[PDB]
Amino acid sequence: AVYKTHVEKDFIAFCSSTPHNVSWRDSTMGSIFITQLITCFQKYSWCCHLEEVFRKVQQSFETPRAKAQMPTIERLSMTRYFYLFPGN
């Protein structure tokens, strides 16, 4: 059986910063982006999907503390909602 499908679909890229910007890394506790990403995954994934978690990550970067940066979600081809469901 042969049937149609899209070449590109079900994709999502969480860039560290906006285009024409710079990402910051702390040489003691790691990069701030991943440090916040792990916290949001560990606290919100139980009740929020991947898109919700990424939105929470972005919201946590709204007011600039020390250096200023903002992650973006580029090339989002996702058609459904992605729930990680940790351990369940």
């Binding site: 710079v22 910051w24 040489s27 020390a66």
Partner: protein, 160 residues
């Protein structure tokens, strides 16, 4: 490229010398190939006063600008006798003699055409700068035509 460098936020005067601190860079590093060198420093007015006043001259050769700081008695920047000093004398309202340490000439910058440096009016050739000394920052007069240390220029952001 819209190059930007160290900013400073706020700091006071200690021992008749002006200090200025910057933001907290606790070992934060960029993810771009080095560079990150400092050329200009402009940002202040985040909410210890750094009084700035404008003066009109009967011999127009640029905008006359004075710098003063707030203390128990207000101090004024000076370049008298080709040396740096803070004089705790308030300006005598509109100055009369053109050759006065109080007033300074402001010149526009090549960067974004929004910032301006200060130029001494009591002497020709001097320039205002802020260099990296120890932990905090030193406002020390340096000659702009000569490349000394990193040659950090002290600009100031104009009102919108």
């Amino acid at each position: 490229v819209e190059d930007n460098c160290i900013n400073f936020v706020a700091m006071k005067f200690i021992d008749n010398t002006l200090y200025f601190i910057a933001e907290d860079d606790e070992n934060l590093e960029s993810d771009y190939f080095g560079k990150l060198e400092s050329k200009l420093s402009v940002i202040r007015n985040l909410n210890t006063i750094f009084i700035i006043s404008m003066y009109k001259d009967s011999q127009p050769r640029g905008m006359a600008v004075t710098i003063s700081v707030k203390c128990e008695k207000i101090s004024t920047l000076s370049c008298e006798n080709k040396i740096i000093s803070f004089k705790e004398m308030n300006p005598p309202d509109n100055i009369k003699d053109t050759k006065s340490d109080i007033i300074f000439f402001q010149r526009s910058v090549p960067g974004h055409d929004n910032k301006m440096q200060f130029e001494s009016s009591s002497y020709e050739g001097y320039f205002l700068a802020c260099e990296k000394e120890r932990d905090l920052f030193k406002l020390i007069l340096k000659k702009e035509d000569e490349l000394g240390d990193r040659s950090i220029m002290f600009t100031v952001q104009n009102e919108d």
